[PDB]
Design a protein around this ligand. Sequence first.
Ligand SMILES: CCCCCCCCCC(=O)CC(=O)N[C@H]1CCOC1=O
Ligand SMILES: CCCCCCCCCC(=O)CC(=O)N[C@H]1CCOC1=O
Lengths: 163, 166
Amino acid sequence: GFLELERSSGKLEWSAILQKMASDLGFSKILFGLLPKDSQDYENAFIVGNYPAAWREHYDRAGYARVDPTVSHCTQSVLPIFWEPSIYQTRKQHEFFEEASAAGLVYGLTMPLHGARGELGALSLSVEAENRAEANRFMESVLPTLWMLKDYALQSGAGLAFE
Amino acid sequence: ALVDGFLELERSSGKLEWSAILQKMASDLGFSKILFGLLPKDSQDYENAFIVGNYPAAWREHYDRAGYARVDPTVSHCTQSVLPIFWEPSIYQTRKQHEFFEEASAAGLVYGLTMPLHGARGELGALSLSVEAENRAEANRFMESVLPTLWMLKDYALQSGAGLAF
Ligand SMILES: CCCCCCCCCC(=O)CC(=O)N[C@H]1CCOC1=O
Ligand SMILES: CCCCCCCCCC(=O)CC(=O)N[C@H]1CCOC1=O
């Protein structure tokens, strides 16, 4: 469920259900971020999940949404972006990668979200693995499930956040 | 085969080739007829959308002339959701939608689903796929078995198609 999410009430339960779905699938951390149509107020987005608060706080105060390559990717594509070191291209993105890595966010992917009413979002999931090769092996194995999941999360989350 | 297909789409030139590749991807997966429809941001010019696929030409023409985009419950669904709408008789609620259902069925579009498309640049679309089956139960079984692949496919199609359309 979807339906757990849909029949759930309030942000806390919804985030809890989404986090457990992510954890059950094999991902330790998740972020669901969503903005309403033609908003680019990334630092004020609807954000759900279990990224370390200190990371979330730094990210927002540093305006990292404007440096993070996954965010720029989300504005350009509906396809997943895997957190390969090569996505971090600029000087500031290298620093971001180092800091993100320190936060435990070295391995993962971001599923862009584009809702029926112009919502702009991301469903990011990090994996704990011994190496990126392992993480990628795992992510490929669950990708089809995740790809459905992100849209269920979107449809439910947009309603929660905005309807 | 899916990522291979996306790569083919992204190495294609022109609408005809792109359309042929997508149709074959759908056919290989087990669907019969497809429609890939796409509008740019803030457009509801449904009767002049970018439309690709192999729906019967007579049906497509009839649909555009009758303005069925404005009656078809899969289209309204696409404007409100990112989740699939399966072509269950129950989605055809109004008398007009019921007439539409009767006519679509005569065109061979009895079993199928529509995957709403919402592109990164505000594109509004549909990827509709029809199923040949002896009965709805068989069609639903099939569709469930390929749903994960189709769910990824629709976004690959959207990402590629959006560039071709606009
Ligand atoms: C696409 C706009 C969404 C609304 C703004 C959300 C801001 C947060 C997005 C985010 O944190 C993406 C993400 O998960 N990045 C990972 C990449 C590695 O470290 C991270 O924080
Ligand atoms: C969401 C707007 C897309 C742009 C306009 C495309 C118009 C065509 C839409 C369409 O044909 C939907 C569809 O596949 N309908 C099926 C339902 C049963 O018979 C049909 O024609």
